[PDB]
Scaffold this active site. Structure first.
Site, short mmCIF file in Angstrom:
data_model
loop_
_atom_site.label_atom_id
_atom_site.label_comp_id
_atom_site.label_asym_id
_atom_site.label_seq_id
_atom_site.Cartn_x
_atom_site.Cartn_y
_atom_site.Cartn_z
N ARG A 84 0.85 -1.19 0.00
CA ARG A 84 0.00 0.00 0.00
C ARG A 84 0.89 1.23 0.00
NH1 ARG A 84 -4.06 -0.13 4.66
NH2 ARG A 84 -5.34 -1.28 3.14
N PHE A 126 1.31 10.60 1.72
CA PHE A 126 0.99 10.10 3.04
C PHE A 126 1.99 9.06 3.54
CE2 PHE A 126 -2.98 11.88 1.48
CZ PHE A 126 -3.44 12.58 2.58
N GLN A 151 3.29 1.51 3.07
CA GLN A 151 3.03 0.47 4.06
C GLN A 151 3.40 -0.93 3.54
OE1 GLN A 151 -0.94 0.66 5.59
NE2 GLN A 151 -0.94 -1.44 6.37
N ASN A 195 -1.86 -1.29 12.29
CA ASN A 195 -2.64 -2.12 13.20
C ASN A 195 -4.10 -2.16 12.77
OD1 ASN A 195 -4.29 -0.03 14.57
ND2 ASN A 195 -2.35 0.63 15.51
N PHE A 250 4.51 1.21 8.56
CA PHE A 250 4.45 2.20 7.50
C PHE A 250 5.53 3.25 7.71
CE2 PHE A 250 2.11 5.71 9.69
CZ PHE A 250 1.65 5.03 10.81
N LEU A 266 -2.71 10.22 13.33
CA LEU A 266 -2.38 8.87 13.76
C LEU A 266 -1.71 8.84 15.13
CD1 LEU A 266 -1.08 7.56 10.31
CD2 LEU A 266 -3.41 7.44 11.29
N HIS A 272 -1.15 4.73 16.49
CA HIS A 272 -0.09 3.89 15.98
C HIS A 272 1.20 4.19 16.74
CE1 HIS A 272 -2.52 2.62 12.48
NE2 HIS A 272 -3.11 3.78 12.72
C1 LIG Z 1 -10.99 8.57 3.93
C2 LIG Z 1 -9.92 7.97 3.05
N1 LIG Z 1 -8.76 7.56 3.84
C3 LIG Z 1 -7.61 8.29 4.09
C4 LIG Z 1 -7.36 9.67 3.61
C5 LIG Z 1 -7.29 10.69 4.54
C6 LIG Z 1 -7.03 11.99 4.13
N2 LIG Z 1 -6.99 13.04 5.05
C7 LIG Z 1 -6.98 12.78 6.50
C8 LIG Z 1 -6.22 13.82 7.28
N3 LIG Z 1 -6.69 15.16 6.93
C9 LIG Z 1 -6.06 16.17 7.79
C10 LIG Z 1 -6.38 15.40 5.53
C11 LIG Z 1 -7.16 14.44 4.65
C12 LIG Z 1 -6.87 12.24 2.77
N4 LIG Z 1 -6.93 11.26 1.85
C13 LIG Z 1 -7.17 10.00 2.24
C14 LIG Z 1 -7.20 8.96 1.14
C15 LIG Z 1 -6.03 9.15 0.22
O1 LIG Z 1 -8.40 9.16 0.40
C16 LIG Z 1 -8.68 8.12 -0.53
C17 LIG Z 1 -6.79 7.55 4.94
C18 LIG Z 1 -7.46 6.31 5.20
C19 LIG Z 1 -7.15 5.17 5.95
C20 LIG Z 1 -8.05 4.10 5.99
C21 LIG Z 1 -9.24 4.18 5.27
C22 LIG Z 1 -9.59 5.29 4.53
C23 LIG Z 1 -8.68 6.35 4.50
C24 LIG Z 1 -7.72 2.88 6.73
C25 LIG Z 1 -8.27 1.65 6.55
S1 LIG Z 1 -7.42 0.50 7.48
C26 LIG Z 1 -6.45 1.76 8.16
N5 LIG Z 1 -6.71 2.94 7.70
C27 LIG Z 1 -5.38 1.47 9.17
C28 LIG Z 1 -4.34 0.48 8.62
N6 LIG Z 1 -4.64 -0.89 9.00
C29 LIG Z 1 -4.30 -1.92 8.22
O2 LIG Z 1 -3.87 -1.77 7.09
C30 LIG Z 1 -4.40 -3.26 8.85
C31 LIG Z 1 -4.64 -4.43 7.94
C32 LIG Z 1 -3.31 -4.29 8.59
C33 LIG Z 1 -2.87 -5.22 9.69
C34 LIG Z 1 -2.96 0.91 9.09
O3 LIG Z 1 -2.44 0.43 10.09
N7 LIG Z 1 -2.28 1.87 8.34
C35 LIG Z 1 -1.00 2.45 8.76
C36 LIG Z 1 -1.17 3.96 8.88
C37 LIG Z 1 -1.72 4.49 7.56
C38 LIG Z 1 -3.03 3.78 7.18
N8 LIG Z 1 -2.84 2.34 7.13
C39 LIG Z 1 -3.47 4.23 5.80
O4 LIG Z 1 -3.44 3.53 4.81
O5 LIG Z 1 -3.84 5.51 5.80
C40 LIG Z 1 -4.12 6.07 4.49
C41 LIG Z 1 -4.22 7.58 4.67
C42 LIG Z 1 -4.26 8.27 3.30
C43 LIG Z 1 -2.98 8.07 5.43
C44 LIG Z 1 -5.46 7.96 5.51
#
Ligand SMILES: CCn1c(-c2cc(N3CCN(C)CC3)cnc2[C@H](C)OC)c2c3cc(ccc31)-c1csc(n1)C[C@H](NC(=O)[C@H]1C[C@@H]1C)C(=O)N1CCC[C@H](N1)C(=O)OCC(C)(C)C2
Ligand SMILES: Nc1nc2c(ncn2[C@@H]2O[C@H](COP(=O)(O)OP(=O)(O)NP(=O)(O)O)[C@@H](O)[C@H]2O)c(=O)[nH]1
Ligand SMILES: [Mg+2]
Lengths: 165, 168
Positions: A55, A60, A63, A102, A113, A122, A126
């Site tokens: 990912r 951002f 991962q 997590n 990540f 976060l 995390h």
């Molecule tokens: C709203 C759309 N969206 C967005 C998002 C958020 C913003 N902003 C938020 C902050 N403001 C100030 C500005 C705008 C803008 N653009 C988007 C995205 C690009 O729009 C498409 C995120 C996100 C995360 C999840 C679901 C939807 C989500 C999610 C779904 S599971 C999860 N997090 C936690 C993830 N567990 C797993 O994988 C588990 C399976 C394993 C064991 C996890 O430990 N990590 C590590 C940390 C990062 C996280 N993954 C991840 O991938 O973060 C993506 C990110 C883009 C950073 C955040």
């Protein structure tokens, strides 16, 4: 008492890209740092070598760390399948931060990540446990193989990894 | 060309939004938990003798990003409100999703279907009566589904298309 350093040799569709090294903050999160260290040496018979960055979301983070199912859902720690959140002392301050992925409270395994930006929302969710030391430009180079939802367009792998002296 | 319907699948984390969508699209059951960022799919179907193209947006249940839903709610034409019949919290979350959709779209008349998923599990905590009463109060259909057995999967998506057709 010196924080350990580990490396990833990154490949893109099997072709070498370069080396990223990490300082692990054993002085603040020793249990979480030791998990990542041991998984980077492979000394328990399993670990990060040969696994993918599944990912990558430009702006951002990158991962990875699922070496048990190789599909983004798996991974395991050296303590069992999962272990608890050690502490949240350290914050997601900017690019290069190394932090545990997590599935909610106390579900750390092996997935991690690397931030490519500040991700302060976060903080407290995390466990931060290290930082890129050398090769941040490798992580920057990995971003173009990502996308909005994180799907990658080439296979980004940890071709080799270990502990530096 | 066949009419296209923009369907959006919403609900709390882990309720089976992705398992339902992948069952519809690919006819198999994901047993592992791969939490969603955002995924989109397309499938042509025949509903009530009329061929239709389904554009399905499978959304994140990840509740820390609740402030990020307005744009996909504005774009979407109909919504599956998914809860799991063994998770009372996910059933309680339904009202928040419906209120958010009605607010963002500024309308009392948005096509929606209430979906109680995981109907194959024995650990039921939400009575079918509770779900039917809620959907009756919303004026929307209620479909019981299992992404594992495929029970109700077509019916839930096809019913939402019927709701959208009635709305036009
Ligand atoms: C709203 C759309 N969206 C967005 C998002 C958020 C913003 N902003 C938020 C902050 N403001 C100030 C500005 C705008 C803008 N653009 C988007 C995205 C690009 O729009 C498409 C995120 C996100 C995360 C999840 C679901 C939807 C989500 C999610 C779904 S599971 C999860 N997090 C936690 C993830 N567990 C797993 O994988 C588990 C399976 C394993 C064991 C996890 O430990 N990590 C590590 C940390 C990062 C996280 N993954 C991840 O991938 O973060 C993506 C990110 C883009 C950073 C955040
Ligand atoms: N027994 C059973 N398990 C199901 C059913 N639907 C989903 N699951 C399981 O529940 C877990 C979460 O399902 P998933 O479809 O990923 O849920 P989600 O609503 O998309 N989660 P997110 O909002 O994080 O993307 C998975 O292990 C999946 O196999 C169902 O009808 N029956
Ligand atoms: Mg999902």
């Amino acid at each position: 008492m010196v924080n350990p350093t580990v490396f990833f040799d990154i490949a893109v569709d099997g072709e070498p890209l370069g080396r990223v090294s990490f300082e692990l903050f054993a002085d603040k999160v020793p249990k979480t740092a030791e998990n990542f260290r041991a998984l980077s040496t492979g000394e328990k018979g399993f670990g990060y070598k040969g696994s993918c960055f599944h990912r990558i979301i430009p702006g951002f983070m990158c991962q990875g760390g699922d070496f048990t199912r190789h599909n983004g859902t798996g991974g395991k720690s050296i303590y069992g399948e999962k272990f608890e959140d050690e502490n949240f002392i350290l914050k997601h301050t900017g690019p290069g931060i190394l932090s545990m992925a997590n599935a909610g409270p106390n579900t750390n395994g092996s997935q991690f990540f690397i931030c490519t930006a500040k991700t302060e929302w976060l903080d407290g969710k995390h466990v931060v446990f290290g930082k890129v030391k050398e090769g941040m430009n490798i992580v920057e180079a990995m971003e173009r193989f990502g996308s909005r939802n994180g799907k990658t367009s080439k296979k980004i792998t940890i071709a080799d990894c270990g502990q530096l002296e | 060309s066949m009419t296209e319907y923009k369907l959006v699948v919403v609900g709390a984390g882990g309720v089976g939004k992705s398992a339902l969508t992948i069952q519809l699209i690919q006819n198999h059951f994901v047993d592992e938990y791969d939490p969603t960022i955002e995924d989109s799919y397309r499938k042509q179907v025949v509903i009530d003798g009329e061929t239709s193209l389904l554009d399905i947006l499978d959304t994140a249940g990840q509740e820390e990003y609740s402030a990020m839903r307005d744009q996909y709610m504005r774009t979407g034409e109909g919504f599956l409100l998914v809860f799991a019949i063994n998770n009372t919290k996910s059933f309680e979350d339904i009202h928040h999703y419906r209120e958010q959709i009605k607010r963002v779209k500024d309308s009392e008349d948005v096509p929606m279907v209430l979906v109680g998923n995981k109907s194959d599990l024995p650990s039921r905590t939400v009575d079918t009566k509770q779900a039917q009463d809620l959907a009756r109060s919303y004026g929307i259909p209620f479909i019981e589904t299992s992404a594992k057995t495929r029970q109700g999967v077509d019916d839930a998506f096809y019913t939402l298309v019927r709701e959208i057709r009635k709305h036009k």
